[PDB]
Symmetry: C5
Subunit: 68 residues, 5 copies
C-alpha cells in the first residue's frame, strides 16, 4: 500500500543502523542501508517520495520506495 507521499521532512540515522524518514507527518524506518544515500539525496533536492509498505501507521518499517 502507498503509506505516504511527499517531500522528506527530516531523516535520522539510528544507533541500530536503521534509517528513519518523516513523510506527510508520519515516520517510517528501513534497514535497507542502500537506501540511506538515495533517501538523503531525495531529501536535499525535495523529490517526491512514496513510502510503500504493508503497515502504514507511523513508526512502521518499509523496504520499498518510489522516487518521483
Amino acid at each position: 500500500a502507498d503509506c505516504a507521499k511527499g517531500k522528506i521532512e527530516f531523516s535520522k540515522y539510528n544507533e541500530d543502523n536503521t534509517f528513519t524518514v518523516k513523510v506527510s507527518g508520519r515516520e517510517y524506518w528501513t534497514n535497507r542501508w542502500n537506501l540511506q544515500p538515495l533517501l538523503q539525496s531525495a531529501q536535499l533536492t525535495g523529490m517526491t517520495v512514496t513510502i510503500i509498505s504493508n503497515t502504514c501507521s507511523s513508526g512502521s518499517g518499509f523496504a520499498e520506495v518510489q522516487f518521483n
Copy 2:
C-alpha cells in the same frame, strides 16, 4: 541492443533489493547495486540514460547503461 533512451521518468527501490527505472514509457530493473546511486543522480540531474539489454520489453532486466 538499445532498449530505451531518454530521461528517467521515475525510479523505485524494490523489496527484493532490485532497482527499477522507467525510461521512454517502459520499466526496467537491475540487481547491480553499484548502479543505484548512479541511476538516481542521472535522474536527479536530468541526464539521458540508454538502457542496454538483450530483451527490450518493459519489465526486463538490464546490467548495462550509458549516461550522456
Copy 3:
C-alpha cells in the same frame, strides 16, 4: 539526548578510521563508517544536524543523528 544542533562547522577523518564533526562549538566522533558520506553531504549542503547521544560533552562518541 540531543547533544548539539546546528550546521557542521568542520569534519575530520581520523587515523583510527573514526570521523569527527564539530557542531555548536563541540566535537563529536563516530565509528559508523556509513555515516561518513552522509555527514559530509550534510556539511556541504548546510543541513542542520542533531547529534544524539548519552554523553553530550565535547569529545564524546555518537551513533545517532538527525538531518533537517
Copy 4:
C-alpha cells in the same frame, strides 16, 4: 602516458563490471571498482579528467587518472 584530456563525453557501465568513459573522442575502460563513482562525479560536474595509460589507442584499459 597522457592518453586523453578533457570532459567525459559519456560513461557506460558494462556487463563484465568494467566501466567505460569517452574522453577526446576516444574510449577507455577500467576494472578498478573505486573509480566508478569518482568518474561519474567528474562527469556530472564536468571536471577535466586526464586518462593515463601505456596504450592510448581507443578501447584500451587504464587504471590511472587525474582530476582537474
Copy 5:
C-alpha cells in the same frame, strides 16, 4: 602536524590504488580508500582541507584530514 592547508589543486588516482592530492603546492597521497570520494567532493566544491601527518614534505603519506 598540519602539513598543508588550502583548496585541492588537483587529485590523482594512482595505479597502486593510492590517491594523491595537491594542496599548497605540495603533493600528498593516501591509501585510505574511504577518503577518495571525500577528497574528491572537497575538491569539487572548493572546501579548505588540512592535511595532517608526521612527515610534511611533498610526496609524504597521510591518513588524517580536516574539512572546512
